[PDB]
Symmetry: C3
Subunit: 327 residues, 3 copies
């Protein structure tokens, strides 16, 4: 209870759209703030930092973790939430996205927006007076997931510089791995990244190209594979795996069918207890969730399974973010 909760001043009043916005020092300030929030909350302390402030969720596509995490974080800061549901709104009388933004912006202090269109967040930004926090924009980015994933690595392993990390699964559509790769390469001295995915679902060039300067000058090693090889298993300090983003492959064309099929047919990427016999002693398995069969329930009892603790780090990072934006 003697710990301060200094807001991160550079976040004040700003929208959060991309992992690109953050400096290394922003990241560590949010990490220590989140960690102090965790200590206070776990000790049973009641925070009243955002009394009388309102978050409104605008979720134009589904969420459990993200919506609930954000609501919980707001509440644990003493904040409030208006439970707006897009599916039961005047969008059903033809209301536009822009008008819907202005509508909840009339009542709220912060908007949390998730949308299947990558450019919808920009549209919202151009009409909103209050900050908007990007909780996922199609296959674009998920910048607060990247921050909490980094809190997880820091808290679990004790260090982010020097790690070897595998990014596994649907890298093409994974807004989580897009933001995470950006945030780690821009701001830390990463030893090596394994990009583990079948050919069709590899990390996009529009993510890798902007990073090419920093990759080359910081000496980050980048290796593509289509499988969890013995080498990937033995060298990785972090195995970060992801779900096939099937709802992004809905055009019913021969290509979407072949891309959907590649996860199981063009790659060997399942993590289970058999495969975990190859891992380091000091390493963690992470997954943004939800998972399907790429991450077996046989790993759940393993102490290196960090994907449940990841969600709780998530709540505290979101608290740190909300307090900083709104202080």
């Amino acid at each position: 209870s003697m710990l301060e909760l200094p807001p991160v001043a550079s976040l004040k009043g700003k929208s959060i759209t991309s992992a690109e916005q953050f400096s290394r020092a922003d990241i560590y300030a949010l990490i220590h703030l989140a960690s102090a929030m965790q200590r206070k909350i776990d000790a049973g302390e009641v925070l009243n930092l955002l009394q009388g402030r309102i978050m409104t969720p605008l979720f134009f596509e589904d969420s459990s973790r993200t919506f609930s995490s954000f609501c919980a974080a707001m509440i644990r800061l003493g904040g409030s939430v208006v439970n707006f549901k897009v599916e039961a709104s005047s969008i059903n009388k033809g209301e536009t996205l822009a008008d819907t933004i202005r509508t909840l912006d009339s009542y709220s202090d912060v908007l949390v927006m998730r949308h299947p269109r990558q450019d919808a967040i920009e549209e919202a930004l151009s009409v909103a007076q209050h900050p908007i926090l990007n909780a996922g924009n199609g296959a674009g980015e998920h910048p607060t997931q990247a921050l909490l994933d980094t809190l997880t690595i820091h808290s679990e392993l004790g260090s982010v510089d020097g790690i070897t990390i595998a990014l596994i699964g649907d890298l093409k559509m994974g807004r989580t791995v897009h933001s995470l790769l950006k945030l780690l390469v821009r701001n830390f001295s990463i030893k090596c990244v394994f990009l583990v995915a079948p050919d069709a679902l590899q990390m996009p060039q529009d993510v890798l190209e902007p990073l090419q300067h920093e990759i080359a000058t910081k000496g980050v090693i980048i290796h593509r594979t289509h499988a969890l090889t013995d080498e990937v298993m033995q060298k990785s300090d972090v195995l970060y795996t992801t779900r096939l983003q099937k709802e992004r492959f809905m055009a019913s064309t021969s290509d979407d069918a072949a891309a959907l099929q590649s996860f199981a047919a063009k790659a060997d990427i399942t993590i289970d207890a058999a495969r975990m016999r190859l891992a380091k002693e000091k390493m963690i398995v992470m997954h943004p969730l939800p998972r399907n069969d790429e991450l077996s329930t046989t790993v759940d009892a393993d102490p290196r399974a960090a994907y449940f603790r990841q969600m709780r780090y998530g709540m505290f990072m979101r608290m740190a973010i909300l307090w900083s934006v709104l202080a």
Copy 2:
């Protein structure tokens, strides 16, 4: 010192809100001044604890963005709480009736906010409820709190409500907002002129106009029906209040372009006037108007929150 800064409107204490007809001119002004004061405190960053421990339950049988969210935000900004009941996930799917649903919410709540597709639904709810019910829209009947926030908007933007010329535009037949607004303005203020701008099949109902004939006569209000935003409607109106289309189809189509407000049509409007829309809008109110200082239909929603604070506080004080 909240009785100096935020005194509740006594006449509203513990009462249900169902119709624009139930308010006096003094009621309206007291709500306006209270709403202005709520706004000043909230905008200054001050945190209100007036309704801590009190619960509002929204009971929305129709879709809403403004009215649902507005009411929740207003309750929360008063320090109160909201129980997020949703009809579609409720025991109504086990054959439960409307009176029983009301009694249920009534056992937990301090105030109910009800929107329903049927006009007589409020009367049924009232006959059974022990706590106040606020009518958030009853079929094609009324929307009494929209009429209050609309009046707050006029008052705050133009300085005065007496003496205005207002056009009510669009689907006046099914528009519960214009039914409530026409009643609140004509009953309580001295309006100079109302233009009722609609194709014939969607004109203002007689059941709204006939009970008003006495106030119309005593105050000498001028009422003109048009099927277009004519040069004259555009030149004389202090307020253009337009609405979304909710024989009627054919007349609507034929009139659409003539009742559309866009930047080209605004070249004929007064320098000092406002465009209002309770929202949501479709094509009858062009996005080309959004940058015009006279476009008041976004600020109108924020006035709504403060007016709803004023209402909730007066009801529950």
Copy 3:
């Protein structure tokens, strides 16, 4: 201070009527009464400020969802409004993973599920207490507690009553928990089981109770009708709806046969088994029952999270 939590419930999941002792039930009853006095006098409680309940409803509710949230709020607590329809279940997430998810952020989970054994599977992974708000045709333990608060407050005594349990007793999770709670912890004079044969109280509820039934000498009679005898002797007529998703009507005419001092109860919602003509009778306790439910849920949440 004036609202001592029930110590035995601290940090515990609530899954069955069986887990309560008579002393537990009375401590909750007196706590719920004290909570009701403070709330009805206008006092604001701040007991659970900063604590979160997440409802996890895999089926429809009106009363149960609302009264849990209202109770939480009136203790000063907060609610995270998780929806199953708008969630990552649609992306393929399992029930266990869903539980772990709400568990990362919440202090207490309130779970309702069409599968009888989903609550057990939930408990095997949750760190925080789960309150069973109804598991299939199994139990509804907090309904049985509020029903007993209702009987206590309305009649003054639970020992000695004659109670009729009426309707769909086979699928009625409410009458399962309530029979268990009454028979184990009180000395009931007589239970009428009023149901057609196909919907009678199940053997898996009656058999575990046979020892208590026999040693307290509870009378148990099965009928398929609300006979004049049931009507004249019952202190409580507890009636229920046909559980469709899985001569008994009470109307003003039938009520001419009831005692002066008795109550009609119904967990709700009702269909035509309980006529609107009964609603203005002072013995119609089924609306007041919902309000006792809110206070008993306050006593429960406070005791769980103190």
